[model samples]
Target: GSSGSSGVDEPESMVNLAFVKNDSYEKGPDSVVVHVYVKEICRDTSRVLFREQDFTLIFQTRDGNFLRLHPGCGPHTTFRWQVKLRNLIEPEQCTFCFTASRIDICLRKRQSQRWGGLEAPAARVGGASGPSSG
Candidate 1:
């Protein structure tokens, strides 16, 4: 009787993940060009999530960011892409474009500094020692 009162239902579906795949980066004369490719969604629906020292870009819609399941009664796999910049960036002059199958995130550097890696390597000090890799 106790179990019957607190039952919860879950939609029947096996989920598959499709996050930021086929991502690439290129070094440019004026900026760093990061290419993101996903098979779905709209250009206008894309938006920027930025911070002073960190940033995230999101693009989602019914067409993209999700995968439809069996017939009509299955669940959906809504996905998102996230990136953390390694250094300071000038967003006032930054630009982005969303097209048929791709998104171009053009981040203008404050001093034309090339970002070899787009993600920041967060420090894990002051806690336990990190896993030693030789």
Candidate 2:
């Protein structure tokens, strides 16, 4: 019996979630280790559990480079993966995605926008007030 079960939970699609360019950083690729856990066993041995196998973690960089992270073993039947931001020397910006089946899952990460911190020019000053005052 091979109750090979994996869990993948993605909140948004490419249309909703996209890789925004970052100018602050040196513009490089970085790596983040994602933790994986099994909420419940497959119960049925019909599938091959991830006990000793490779899992997939997809990450799309700002430069349009897609990378996959393999599985890493952990305690208590736990698993993990490493999503690498390639080419760049540092963490620039990118969009991530994952998928798995056989248990309830939850995931959260820092959001990256193209121009998140860039401030706008000062509002034009009008006669004793500003244009927005109207």
Candidate 3:
């Protein structure tokens, strides 16, 4: 919150994330271990969140210098998948296509940062366009 202690204001960068479950259960359930590729650099702030049918993850840094999440490592449970994030080029709602086989999460930059939010891109997805609740 205190400018990260760098003393210099850095450019804000964001990405569109998607988690696609590709394999079956290797672990039991309710247990997931995802290996993110942050140049093999792991941060202490990286975390995961549970969702209705899946989960969401956030990694990297806010100074546009870190690679957040990864989409290709797992032995998770309680519905597992690969996670990927891409630079946002549209200002649209985040899309998540859910199915019995795999769950895909489409992420984007946050629309408005004036409302106590982080800096995000103006790109949107699909035909829907507005403030992103990503």
Candidate 4:
């Protein structure tokens, strides 16, 4: 490829996506949203995918709990998702976690190409480790 106008190289097709952890305990029942980034090699309806149906986020524990994202999430599209963890009786004891096959694929899609690529961060939950626990 031409490396684009930014002179930055993009991933082959799919990229790594970082999993950002979130919590609703400290901030209350309010929802938390995560914008996933992916890429599309071709323009076809068959490539349309989502965390709920197509794929799932895997935590470091090797356990995958698919994110509940808004409709219309797919490749080359920025997917916004949210998770509610306020029901936890002990927020401190509970750990928030985020995971993915690849960090770049988890970002807002095309945006990853601009940043070159993404470095998949570790998966964890609870306290300052995530956006919640306060």
Candidate 5:
């Protein structure tokens, strides 16, 4: 078959798994959640393709390990937001949860700040850092 379909993912709302209190992440948005919304079949006829290992939420504070669906047909894309730094601890404080539709990341910035503009492109960041820009 020919490959003729495509897209990607990133941020969204706390309308998913928002456990953070309004007192801390209060009033204006403090970039509380980093949403990983993937388009895949779920609890449907096509959902028969889903596997048990798909519940991947290796939510690391520094080196986050997250991924998308693999239906054995289209190419799969994996995501990692680890940065480049010295002895200083990574400012990224992250947590996540997955639903039947999308994987919600309750990402909390160390100082509750923005993601250096959606996602950090740290000076020494390796892997697929800062989204697919090609």
Candidate 6:
């Protein structure tokens, strides 16, 4: 009766809480980090839903790349991740799709789009004013 060296096998699919930053100096680092507390769902497919709180934030950039951040380690409801941005040319844009069980999440942030500054409050999954900070 052991949980084994690893908590569970690698997730069948990975859901990324994406973020992007143009001026890294503002946040000090060119990259962003997000700590997600996830509750494992013992189903045919492996899925992870991030529990947003104090540090559960999604940063956006004006570029065509969506950055994802991942933390080092945690069990059950104490995991984290980090993401970065990438440049594009012929492709023009990029798309990422993640699915598990019957759940599917597709993410694709536009390029050269302006994000609301430190004025708007944190919005829910699909807020009206796009994604905001502060």
TM-score of every candidate relative to the true structure: 0.55, 0.15, 0.27, 0.16, 0.31, 0.19
Candidate 1 vs candidate 5: the lDDT winner is 1
Best by lDDT: 1
Which pairs in model 1 have colliding backbones? none
Give the number of the best model, judged by TM-score. Answer: 1
Query: Per-residue alpha-carbon lDDT of model 2 for 7-98, expressed as tens digits?
Result: 67553332221222211232222223332232232233212111111222222222112111222311222122222221222222222222
> Mind giving the per-residue lDDT tens digits that candidate 6 earns over 1-134?
76668666653343334332222212212222222222232232333233221122222211112222344312222222332223211112222222231222222333343434412345457647644765
TM-score of 4: 0.16
User: lDDT, candidate 3, residue 44?
Assistant: 50
lDDT of 5 by residue, 28-130 (tens): 2443443444434222211111111121232212111212122221222222223221122222434444555444544333344333333224567468658
Q: Is candidate 1 or candidate 5 better by TM-score?
A: 1
**lDDT score for candidate 2 against the true structure:** 0.26
Off by over 4 Å in 1: 1-19, 61-80, 122-134
Task: Give the residue spans of candidate 4 off by over 4 A.
Answer: 1-28, 41-134
Q: Give the Cα-based TM-score of candidate 2 against the true structure.
A: 0.15
lDDT of 6 at 112: 40
Instruction: Supply candidate 5's per-residue lDDT for 10.
Output: 43
Model 1 lDDT per residue over 37-108, tens place: 554655555565555455566555454233342233222332335556677877777777765676677776
For candidate 2, give the lDDT of residue 64.
Answer: 13
TM-score of 1: 0.55
- The lDDT-based order of candidates, best leading, equals 1, 3, 5, 4, 6, 2
